[model samples]
Target: QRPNVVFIYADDIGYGDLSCNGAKTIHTPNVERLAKMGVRFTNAHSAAATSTPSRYAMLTGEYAWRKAGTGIAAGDAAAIIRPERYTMANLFKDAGYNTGVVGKWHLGLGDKGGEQDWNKPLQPGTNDIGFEYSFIMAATGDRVPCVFVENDQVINLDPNDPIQVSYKANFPGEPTGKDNPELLKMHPSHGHDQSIVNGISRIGYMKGGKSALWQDEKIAETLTGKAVSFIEGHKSAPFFLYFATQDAHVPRVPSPQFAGKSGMGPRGDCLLEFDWSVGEILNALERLGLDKNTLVILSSDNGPVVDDGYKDQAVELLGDHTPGGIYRGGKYSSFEAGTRIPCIWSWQGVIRPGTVSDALLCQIDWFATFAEMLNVRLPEGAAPDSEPMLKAWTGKQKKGREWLVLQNAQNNLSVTDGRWKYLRPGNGPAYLKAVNIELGNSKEPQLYDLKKDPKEKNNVAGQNPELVKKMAAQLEKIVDGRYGLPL
Candidate 1:
């Protein structure tokens, strides 16, 4: 029988956030359980550090840059994925695996048209992307109306109570977090200060859909329940479940049962909740007798950030708890901390317990790797960036991919054999002033032998011009859109 697949993705989670990874402020025994039961990769990187682009790469296997001008969208923004694009869901569903997405859907949806007819079926959603079942929040908890969507339809949308949204300006009379500070539980300090949703400020404006709104506290449980139901509903057949958790991201509102559970405040508390989610899923597997027959992949979308958009006391309360581990820079940069994340693969008795691997891997590799496991041909133009890293995952191959690409916002950097890391030129803040991370973009080209300097403390570009010249040629090919070269 084909193995059931469960991909548990945490949004904006950093490298050091888990207890297994040495986070003392937050407890994550559930994640540690997976680490103990399976092989944990100490050197795994995401396709990108940001959601919109990274998600595009993971699902479609093509670079998000190929999508032309698509960035993080408003809750009501136009769809980003074109109707014909082949995604991971499309691939799995075509192979007869029941597929579902039960969390954030940041990839653009609805009609490609500027405005979609809400009354009609919205195309290019989870369904269009190959998922037969979907329970999604269009962008994120802190983005807009903070409502749930089933498939492409807005759940509980009332015709009489039309939903109005805007990013440019608030509705004529809505009590915005900007104008009405009295209505906010958490005030915005930067980009997310438009409407007040769930008592906290958000990025976009929403006029109605009051009853359809989501409770921030119950979000973890809610999504967990949906995932459990999905598994039970498809226990007999091979299923691909992508459970994307929205916590430690923004609007860090942990449930009352978990509030103050972690001394790290709401951000840390959310990490605890995320840990609970992992335990819940594991229990579901045991109850369903699917633990031994399933392949579980646990990872994060990107690195961590504190004081990301709100004044949640993340900085003041933080006491030497490094969310990004020891890697330099955090989210939205070319540094190791941005994309390098914990990658744990567990298969109850199939995988050796307590094994650790340091093979350089990318989340994108799952596309072709899973296809290889199932004896399916990967269609062209899908997960083109994904490589077959199954050997490293299965403990058959000790060494992994020689080189990988790392994307942040729009900048692209290259890492070869997890030893040499290079960054091209770009324009950005000298230092991400608000978050205080080194932007990683410099006027001059940068080269570092990460083996000699894991922290990337020194620049070896000037000393090793010959090596830089050799790597620069290969890096240029990546930037020049070349592929299929063995690094």
Candidate 2:
């Protein structure tokens, strides 16, 4: 009696922009209908390399480069999981399950940074860590108080237009894209030009939540109608939601019967509105029968970006849409398309459908496989790098995570074993020049051979000299053996 889990999470999705990970030009029929039944995990990843250290290492199973401001915040930063951290929504609210968390909460909200207030209840919210139903969007939509918060208020705000934020300044008179570039519709080709809201222009400095703004063409049907009404009010029991979709990230604005239906503009109509919000959460878990005992789990929290600060032609109408398929570097780059990505899963008949797994997974080990699927008892230094894998995530065997660590967005670190990855010789610019990516940096070492170069363009580290000195002395003893720190 424990199944329902949902977990969509797609923002800046990658691993070849989906059509079940091949992308002929965005055609993810609901994540290829959960990869036609399930598994599709051709060596997954994505727990970092952008987006608030890949969602603070997926809700604190730790590893956002062993702490330090958990970067990429400032939509009013503060609250980098400090509610006495131990989340994964506090282990599904301590196994009683019913957590919610609807969408795009760039992992930072209250308790300090830039003195937030935005009109009330904002202290370490997501209800102080465990998300007992929170709506969110406190950041990203290019960033700003463009409204919508829920469990800590803000919804249609305006207790007389209160809500003034700032990443530094610009309020009196307001209007920017750097000095109002003709009231923008969607400008900026770098550094999201500063707070403008609906007519685009964002990335900090909001002011007086004009009756609670928000309408980048109605944010994909208002966060898919509050995540299908939080899956129909917890469809009768065990719930966990965590939806998190911002239609393939950025202000791509596709809504008017999905505007140009993807000829690849607005990043292929926001990847067909993020595959229609994953076909409305798998048709609301198959209309609440909870789709034969739910489990869902799609992915992406990082990897894939094209002119990330939107002047939309996502890199001049990219006629072939390879977002990061034949992987190299994207989104930030520690290579392998910055943390591999695209991990399907489903759970209909308990996995085993199209079964195509090269297994080397890592969603930070889903908090030690959901605490071994609630047989709970992770207590000794709990989830320290979460590695249980719940029998390779319910598949029954095909184990995973023998070694994997890949961060980047400057916290650079890379090491993999799914077929030897290693890229640890950093220092600086191997090209990140404002979103062009390919930052698999160097000063010396950098190997590859993801099975005869799966587009990592062969580096073979001087023909594997002692497997690159035992993977650079096991990646410097796996981050100086402080392991997944958080204590």
Candidate 3:
């Protein structure tokens, strides 16, 4: 029988957020269990530092920076990946695996850019992207159109209560978070101050469909149920489940069982909720006797962020827990922590327990790697940027990619050669004043020997000008090359 594959993706989780990843404050026993059973990768990274771009790169197997419209999208933005593009899901589907994507899908849906008929069946959605089944949040918890999209139709949607969403302006007579602070359960510290959903303010405006809106606290259980059901239904078949969890993101609201369990506040409690979701999936696999044959991979979409937009007491209650570990920057920065994240692959008897690897791996590499595992030869221009590292992923190889590129939200690029890292110069403030994040922008070329200075404190560009010039030329060549490659 063909082995099953499940990719559990956590949103906004960092390299050091999990207890196995050096987090002291928030305990993640399920993640720790996976680490104990599988090989934990130390130098793994996401393709980009932000959610939309990072997810775009992972699903499409092409760097998000290659496309003009692949930046952080609005809630109503059109689909970034064209239907013609061959995705990871397409690879698995062609291999006779039942593929599905659950939880957050920041990649936009529909063909139109801004206009989408939510009442009717939305086309060019997850199904169009090769996922046979999908239950996802169109954008994020903090954005509008906050109803669950199951397959083509919006779940629990009432015909009488039509939903209307807009980022340009609010609908007439609709109460907003900015104007109606009295009605809010959570206030915005920055940009998330628009439509009020479930007593919380969101990023955009929405009207009607109140009954179909998701409750903040019950979201984990809601998505977990769907994920469990999907696994149980496909236990006998060769399945590919992309389980994306929305915990630890903005408006962090844990279930009643997990609420107040963490001393660090809601953000900490969200860690517990996410762990519980992992345990649920693990239990389902074992209960169905599919654990030994299933290849389970756990990772995050990008790095961590304390105060993204809401006043969730993340900054104040953060006593000593370092979300980014020893890395210089967190999410949305061109630093190690911005893209480097926890990558654990557990294949039971196939992989040795308690193994650790420092291979230079990336989430974008999954497309070609999985294709190789399935013995599927992809056509040219399909998954162009994906590099097959099957041995590195399965703990058969010591080293993976020779080099990798990292992209930030500002479109800045950085390249790493496993030892030295080089960040190119650009015009921007050194720090994003509002979010208090280092943008990694400097007038001079920045170089750091990562093997010596893991925190990226010292820039050795002056000492190695020739090395910088050579690496800079290579970075330019990568940027000018074609988008994707095939087997």
Candidate 4:
């Protein structure tokens, strides 16, 4: 029997967020269990620092910064990945594995038609991208069009009500977070003050389809149920499940059962909820006796952000817990924490228990790596950035990729060879005050011995001028080269 694949991709989770990763405040027992049973990677990274670009890079095995319209997408934006390109899901599909994606999908859907008909099947959706069964949030918790899309159709949608979404302007007479602050249960700290849905304010404007709207607190259970059902339905066949969790993202609301459980407030409680989600899936797998043959990989899309957009007491209540662990900068930064996230891979009997690997791995490698594992032939010029590191992933190899590139929100890039890291400079404020994150921008090229200075405090660029020039030239060449399908 072919081994099952499950990738649990969480949003905005940090390196130190889990107890297994030295988090003292919160104990993620489920994730910790996986860590104890699997290889806990000390050096694993997402391709980009933010959601849209990071998700696109992970699913397509290509750097989102290399293409236009791959930036942080608005809730109403067009589909970023077209149908023609072979994707991560395609790799599994070609290998005769049933492919399904559930949870937060920020890689825009439908067409380049600007707005989509939510009542109808949104083409160029998960099906077009190789996910046969998909139930995803169009964007995120903090974004508008606050509804679930089940295989391109807006779930619970009524044709008469319809849905209208816009990033430019608000629909007339639509109660907005900007104007209707009194109606909001959660207020925006910065941005995300456009539309009001489910007592919370969001980034973009949306009207109608109130019946299809998702409840923030209930999102965890709902998405988890769909993912569990997906697994239950595909027990006999080899399957690949891309399970994205929204618990760590904005409007951090946990169900009533988990409310006030964490001293760190809603943000901390969200970690608990996310852990519960992991436990649910783990239990499901074990209950079905699929745990022994399943290859489970748990990770995050990007880094953590406490005061992301909501006034949920994240900063004030984030007392002793270090969200970014020992690393400096977060979320939108080019710093280690931005892309360097938690990664745990477990394959029973096949993988050694209680193993810790300091392999420098990137999420982009999964496409080609899984292809190699499943004995699938990758189409020519596909997943150019995804190097086959199946040995490293399964703990057969001691180390990971030779070098990897990191992309920040502003499109700044960094290249790292496990120990030494070089962040190319660009124009912008070095620190983004609003999010309380270092944007990692500068006029001067910066280099850090990541082994010694994991926090990236000292810039040793002046000391190693030749190395900076060499790495800078290398990154320039990478940027100039064709890494993925043409837009």
Q: TM-score for all predictions? A: 0.96, 0.33, 0.98, 0.98
Q: Between candidates 1 and 4, name the one with more favorable lDDT.
A: 4
lDDT of 1 by residue, 55-142 (tens): 7778877655545544455677666766577778877888889999999888766764336554445676788768899998888788
lDDT of 1: 0.80
Q: What is candidate 2's lDDT per residue for 375-436, written digit by digit as tens?
A: 88865655587777766765667768889887887786888888888887867788866687
**lDDT score of residue 372 within candidate 2:** 80
- Where does candidate 1 clash, by residue pair? 61-383
Q: Candidate 3 residues 1-487, lDDT tens each?
A: 3589998899888887899877878889999999998899999999999998888888888888888778888889888887888899999898899999999998888888668988878888899878999999988889988899999678887879999888889898998888888999888989888999999999888898878899989999999999999999998889999999989898898999998888888888998899999999989998999987999999998888988888888889988888888898888899898999988999987788889998889999998889888878997889888999889998988989988988987888898888889998876678876677787878889999989999999999999989999899988887885433321
Error of model 3, residue 354, in angstroms: 0.9
**Candidate 2: worst 10 consecutive residues by lDDT?**
478-487
lDDT of 4 by residue, 1-487 (tens): 3699998888999999888898878989999999998999999999999988888888888888888778888777778988888898888887788999999998888886456877788887888888989999998888888999988888898777888888888889988778889999988999978988888989888889989999998999999999999999998889999999998899898999888888888999999999999999999999999997899999999999989998999999899898889998889999998998999999998889889888999999998888888777789978878898788998888879888889998888899889999998887788877899988988888999998888899999999989998889878777776533356
lDDT of each: 0.80, 0.81, 0.88, 0.88
Model 2 misses residue 453 by how many Å?
A: 24
At residue 454, candidate 2 shows an lDDT of: 77
Q: Order of candidates by lDDT, top first?
A: 4, 3, 2, 1
Candidate 3, superposed: residue stretches over 4 Å from native = 481-487
